[PDB]
Design an enzyme around this catalytic site. Structure first.
Site, PDB file in Angstrom:
ATOM      1  N   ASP A 162       0.819  -1.207   0.000  1.00 46.01           N
ATOM      2  CA  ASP A 162       0.000   0.000   0.000  1.00 46.01           C
ATOM      3  C   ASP A 162       0.853   1.257   0.000  1.00 46.01           C
ATOM      4  OD1 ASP A 162      -1.909   1.915   0.317  1.00 46.01           O
ATOM      5  OD2 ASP A 162      -2.399   1.409   2.416  1.00 46.01           O
ATOM      6  N   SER A 173      -0.587  15.506 -12.159  1.00 44.70           N
ATOM      7  CA  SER A 173      -0.846  15.131 -13.538  1.00 44.70           C
ATOM      8  C   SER A 173      -1.088  16.380 -14.366  1.00 44.70           C
ATOM      9  CB  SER A 173      -2.046  14.187 -13.608  1.00 44.70           C
ATOM     10  OG  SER A 173      -2.436  13.939 -14.946  1.00 44.70           O
TER      11      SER A 173
END
Length: 330
Positions: A35, A199
């Site tokens: 994770d 992004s």
């Protein structure tokens, strides 16, 4: 040193991925959920409330000659999906795909929430975010990667998750045969303890690319792709019959649909998520309404590039003095 381990989807929907981990001496192999959105290595154990164990493999520290109780240490964690666990702490030897750390904090669960109990395939979590998020008290502990880092050939790990198929976590090296083209690297902020990056935009299907900054986290422990409501609405508007359902808890779509791809930007590069990756199947057994793999982050407070996005790429988690993230197509 290096390590290399195969990671396998837990079910036919890729709801999560498990990777075998050796703990203790002799080794006790547990299948952990790696994770990158948290920083605790915790396991079902011989100390876990019996009614809360249902099929998981447990770690039994009393059977490990290298286990030592970390005196006075406790831990307690709550995840973004509302699940939680807590307990006490041992140090022990932990190996992943041939890479060994001695003295790793292994957090033994005394209590786990129902969602963990109900998932027989996940024996615990192995956190790979920054150690500043580790919940051990009163002395915070380091992640497996943080402990291994100085020994690694290169201070990196990579995630290569499969679509409906196994994939690989590598530590300490970049497998240049595992991706196509080049790896594009992008800046990381560690201010919130995550692999947080920006992004450069998105496209829906064959549509034009929209240049827009989207700050979010690379999180292997989250199943879906959570993005701003504007972006998500633009995606689902291209699927006839798709709608946001408050009763179901997100966007659903007719299971008869063909889903468009979704592209996200990494610098000037582009990662394409095929439409099929966005299908999470019937909302309930036998339903013709299917759950979407792209969902709104509104009210999460952060955008999350979870498995839906990451499995479309070869992803480098670069833990150099100034961390960065790399993405390649594959």
């Amino acid at each position: 040193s290096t390590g290399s381990a195969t990671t396998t989807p837990i079910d036919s929907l890729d709801d999560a991925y498990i990777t075998p981990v050796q703990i203790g001496t002799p080794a006790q192999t547990l299948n952990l959920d790696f994770d990158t959105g948290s920083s605790d290595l915790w396991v079902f154990s011989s100390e876990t409330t019996a009614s809360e164990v249902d099929g998981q493999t447990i770690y039994t520290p009393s059977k490990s000659t290298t286990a030592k109780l970390l005196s006075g240490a406790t831990w307690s964690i709550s995840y973004g999906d509302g699940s939680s666990s807590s307990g006490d702490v041992y140090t022990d030897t932990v190996s992943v795909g041939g890479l060994t750390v001695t003295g790793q904090a292994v957090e033994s669960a005394k209590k786990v929430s129902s969602s963990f109990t109900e998932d027989s395939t996940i024996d615990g979590l192995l956190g790979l975010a920054f150690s500043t998020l580790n919940t051990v008290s009163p002395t915070q502990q380091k992640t497996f990667f943080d402990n291994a880092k100085a020994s690694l050939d290169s201070p990196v790990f990579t995630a290569d998750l499969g679509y409906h198929a196994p994939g690989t976590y590598n530590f300490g090296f970049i497998d240049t045969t595992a991706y196509t083209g080049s790896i594009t690297y992008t800046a990381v902020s560690t201010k919130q303890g995550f692999w947080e990056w920006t992004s450069t935009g998105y496209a829906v299907g064959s549509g034009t690319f929209k240049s827009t900054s989207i700050d979010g986290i690379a999180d292997t422990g989250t199943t879906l792709l959570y993005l701003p409501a504007t972006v998500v609405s633009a995606y689902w508007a291209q699927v006839s019959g798709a709608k946001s359902s408050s009763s179901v808890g997100g966007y659903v779509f007719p299971c008869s649909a063909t889903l468009p791809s979704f592209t996200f930007g990494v610098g000037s590069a582009r990662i394409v998520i095929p439409g099929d990756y966005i299908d999470f199947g019937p909302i309930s057994t036998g339903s013709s309404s299917c759950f979407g793999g792209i969902q709104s982050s509104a009210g999460i407070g952060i955008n999350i590039f979870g498995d839906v996005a990451l499995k479309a790429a070869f992803v480098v988690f670069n833990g150099a003095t100034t961390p960065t993230l790399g993405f390649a197509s594959k």
